[PDB]
Paper text:
The [name] transporter [name] exports the antibacterial peptide MccJ25 in [name]. Four genes are required for the biosynthesis and export of MccJ25 (Duquesne et al, 2007b): mcjA encodes the linear precursor of MccJ25; mcjB and mcjC encode enzymes involved in the post‐translational modification of McjA to the lasso structure; and [name] encodes an [name] exporter that is required for both MccJ25 secretion and self‐immunity of the producing strain towards MccJ25 (Choudhury et al, 2014). We have previously functionally characterized and determined the high‐resolution structure of [name] from [name] (Choudhury et al, 2014). Its core architecture is composed of a dimeric transmembrane domain (TMD) of 12 transmembrane (TM) helices, which forms the translocation pathway across the membrane bilayer and contains the ligand binding site, and a dimeric nucleotide binding domain (NBD) where ATP binds and is hydrolysed. In this study, we have determined its structure in a novel conformation, apo inward‐occluded and a new nucleotide‐bound state, high‐energy outward‐occluded intermediate state, with a defined ligand binding cavity.
The [name]‐apo structure was also determined by molecular replacement using the [name]‐AMPPNP structure but only after splitting the [name] monomer into two domains, TMD and NBD. Inspection of the NBDs did not reveal any electron density for nucleotides that may have been co‐purified with [name]. A striking difference between [name]‐apo and other apo [name] exporters, such as MsbA (Ward et al, 2007) and PglK (Perez et al, 2015), is that its TMD is in an occluded conformation, similar to the [name]‐AMPPNP structure, whereas the NBDs have disengaged in the absence of nucleotides. This conformation is called here apo inward‐occluded. Inward‐facing [name] exporters display domain intertwining of TMs 1–3 and 6 from one subunit and TMs 4–5 from the opposite subunit, which results in opening of the TMD to the cytoplasmic side of the inner membrane (Ward et al, 2007; Perez et al, 2015). In the inward‐occluded [name], TMs 3–5 from one subunit have moved towards the equivalent TMs of the opposite subunit, resulting in the loss of intertwining and occlusion of the cytoplasmic opening. The [name]‐apo structure can be superimposed with the [name]‐AMPPNP structure with an rmsd of 2.1 Å over 569 Cα atoms; their TMDs can be superimposed with an rmsd of 0.7 Å over 290 Cα atoms. The NBDs of the [name]‐apo have separated by 7.9 Å (measured between S509 and S509’) relative to the [name]‐AMPPNP structure, a distance much shorter compared to MsbA‐apo with a distance of 35 Å (Ward et al, 2007). The NBDs have moved in a “scissors‐like” motion similar to the transition between inward and outward‐open MsbA. We designed the A122C mutant at the beginning of TM3 on the cytoplasmic side of [name], with a Cα‐Cα′ distance of 7.3 Å.
Author numbering:
A (entry chain A), B (entry chain A): 9 to 579
Amino acid sequence: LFNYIYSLMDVRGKFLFFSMLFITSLSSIIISISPLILAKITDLLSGSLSNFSYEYLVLLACLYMFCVISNKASVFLFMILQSSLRINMQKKMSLKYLRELYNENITNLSKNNAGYTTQSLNQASNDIYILVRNVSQNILSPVIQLISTIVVVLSTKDWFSAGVFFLYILVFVIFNTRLTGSLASLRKHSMDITLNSYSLLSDTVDNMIAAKKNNALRLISERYEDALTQENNAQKKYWLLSSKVLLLNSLLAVILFGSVFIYNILGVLNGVVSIGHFIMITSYIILLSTPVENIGALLSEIRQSMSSLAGFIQRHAENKATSPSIPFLNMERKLNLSIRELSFSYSDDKKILNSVSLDLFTGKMYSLTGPSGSGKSTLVKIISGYYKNYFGDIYLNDISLRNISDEDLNDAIYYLTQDDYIFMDTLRFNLRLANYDASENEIFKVLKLANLSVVNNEPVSLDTHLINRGNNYSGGQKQRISLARLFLRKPAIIIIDEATSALDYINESEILSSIRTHFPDALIINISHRINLLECSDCVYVLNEGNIVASGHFRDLMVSNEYISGLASVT
Amino acid sequence: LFNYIYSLMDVRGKFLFFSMLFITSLSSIIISISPLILAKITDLLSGSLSNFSYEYLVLLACLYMFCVISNKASVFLFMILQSSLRINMQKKMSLKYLRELYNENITNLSKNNAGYTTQSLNQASNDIYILVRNVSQNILSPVIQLISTIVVVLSTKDWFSAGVFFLYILVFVIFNTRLTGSLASLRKHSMDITLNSYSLLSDTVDNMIAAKKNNALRLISERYEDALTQENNAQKKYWLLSSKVLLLNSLLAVILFGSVFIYNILGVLNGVVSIGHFIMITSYIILLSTPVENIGALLSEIRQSMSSLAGFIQRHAENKATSPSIPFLNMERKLNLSIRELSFSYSDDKKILNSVSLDLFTGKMYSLTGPSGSGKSTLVKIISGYYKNYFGDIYLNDISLRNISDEDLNDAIYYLTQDDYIFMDTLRFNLRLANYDASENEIFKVLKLANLSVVNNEPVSLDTHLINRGNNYSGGQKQRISLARLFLRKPAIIIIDEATSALDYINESEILSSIRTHFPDALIINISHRINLLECSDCVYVLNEGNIVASGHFRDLMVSNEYISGLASVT
């Protein structure tokens, strides 16, 4: 946990922290002499008061002031160094999640929305900054100011004060650490529900168009008001208990340090305690409020932030990629396919796939028809690397798919959906998304073969913008955007699913053969009921509610079974 | 601006602020007596020192301590009252944007993503809280502590100190207010680029699936690193200048208050100034650092937060809805249609619509065919209430569409798209989105007519969840979800666009006639090239690249023009 925080510090990052560590711990020394200086200032007024006993008052006045100026200017140096550190430990932090999300599975990206992660990352940098505000300052600065006090009073031989001052620190730690336990899980849940409070704003602001079109303003507001009060009442539970802990600790200061002020004020009127000794003991308590309270700031803030930070390490940083079965993917390409007894359970309630023992061999065109999405559209999604809640193993040239990590898996297995994923930027962006190694020459080359170079009988520029959810291009052009990424990249096993729903023959002839042209040694798989696409194939499969039922050519399936016979009569 | 901040305070909200105002302004009084108490403590040590001149030292010691305890415990009461206020001024703030977004146009929702608003609202509650931290505390608390100082020193007749103490406050305001001007627009831009820094994370985390599938990890990281440094360097420009302003103001304290400490320390060694008078003047400067610095906190924090808060009022709170042309919508329904010379300019570069003078009359079925999306799909979107960058007026029973506000406009004009807008919750949620007045009885009633009640020959429960971007249901079922909202609501002018792209005759016969059944007096408009849907119509229109070209029946258009003749030959 600690290493991940210190990892954010680069060259300048590690240089400003040690600067922060010294400067703050230096101010503690100069401020510890401060009560002792005024004691000898006060004592001096009852002295002989000759030539040098009026110049000493002047001297020590500056000596006390300098100590204040030094510790004063030290905090401004502390909040300038940290403000410089705030920038440096944000740059190398923003990507330390971006890249963590990339390598993590879709099963943890489908259940997380845009606004969720906007706050999930917001609380991480919020807690680490607070953890630095405690690791640097509150670790040494109070400790140095507190130890001086214990011995100084023990040295001047005021044993009671030397006891009670130690007893407050003795009690204060036990009281806080025991209570922090729940306060931590309460700030945890408070931030966890605060997380969920904006997990709904994400779904709100995105689909507000429909809400405006259906006018359920109240539902939008009321559903949001429900989570809002779920947060407030969970924040009440924490604030209440946190505030109640204060009145306890602050009462103790009046209990212990109040009685010490009483103790010495009694002994001073007699003659057991001098004016200065009394003045020093009261001024010590006066300057004992600063370390005592900042010791508390350490104990709590560190623990509650560490628990709310722990809910960021045990989910994204492994055990998804341990750098294990990175092998292999053949370099001459061609990897075939072999599935043996595939079974899925989404919500456990039913069996998606029952028994699937199939073997496919690369370099030829295959097809998947029958009862629509009964387990044919999903079968290839588990293969492509969406879910790992399946049974058996999917072998691809001596290697099962459950073994290969998602970084090497997507290099050979490229899958085309109906639901295309387009960004909110230039044409170049989405095209260079398939490859950063492909520059302007091959980019415009893939465009003429992706049937989107010349749109409305006029060539499209590469700086042409695109609006969110594919709001810039039509139903047919949204699918052809998903097609440009295919020719720009180079896979070994290609899968196609009902992406020929928003396309016609004048453009379906120039696309279905170009895949065979560019990728001939590859394993092309298509999932579209069209008879003209089911005929070009070397092998056709029928998938009824999960289990495999038929296989072979189109001319044998339209004679043997009656679905392919009742699909070939609708031409 | 100020009224919108005070509006957040309800009954308990307005009660805790006045509690905050008194308690903080009360601590300023007790702390102003503090330097004067120690002055008479110090002076007393050079006195006659009889019976009552050792009991007075004891008395004033408590009197000084109580003053510290009072001001000390006052800050904990201040940060407990504000922590209570933080909850109360968040509940009535979260919706004070949710509802502001609802009434605002799509043209300001298409250009704003989920993560943008997650931070656009985050900085609003961040600046108001800071503004309360200045309006309550820093308005009175320093002012009371500062005025006492001016007269006390003027009363004790130390005219120089009474001058220089006033001169620092005289200079400090002019220095800060002149420099704040740019610092405000720099924190503005800093927060504006910080806004834009996460405007890309929204597009990143949402479409990470494609990035993982196309492996452009570097591009994702590098594009994010580009905005990250665009932020850091814009944050550098602010921090640098802000930090440079400190070393100036803090030098002035050593320039002015340093020389006053020198002034009196010179006059004390002589006999012009007594021990106590000197001790009080030094202790005043000592306790003058607290109001002076907190006066600065007011001057700046208020101005920079007010400018970064101003960029939240002049965009959402009007001039979209002034409560003007709320009239009318006929109660017996039937409102007809009348467009006169419609023209659009998206990027100005071209003319989307050239000349459109058309009149439609309610109670009958209409159609729009021809060259796909050439201005036929967009024509109805400007009508439905998407854009106001058009020419002319669209009259609907003596009222032009440019006049009716979007709240009354969506009640009669309901439009069905291909791109459906589904949420991330239960079946009930999306269904009750069309109406909150419709309970369980009519909800299940619309389901059997929306062809989604009995899915896979098994009835679907109303607590059935749905995954983001329609990831739970298929291409055909995503369109039929958009259809249930139609029968659940009651419009006067219905528009349909290529939503019959992912549907077949066994379900297209049970839907196309049910709209005529449920809404007969309504103006049904369809935009689908299908000949069977173009025949049922009372009037068909042809739309070529913006301008109107043909109108009339299907049997006259398939004889007169050659497109409808070359569309009716493909059956």
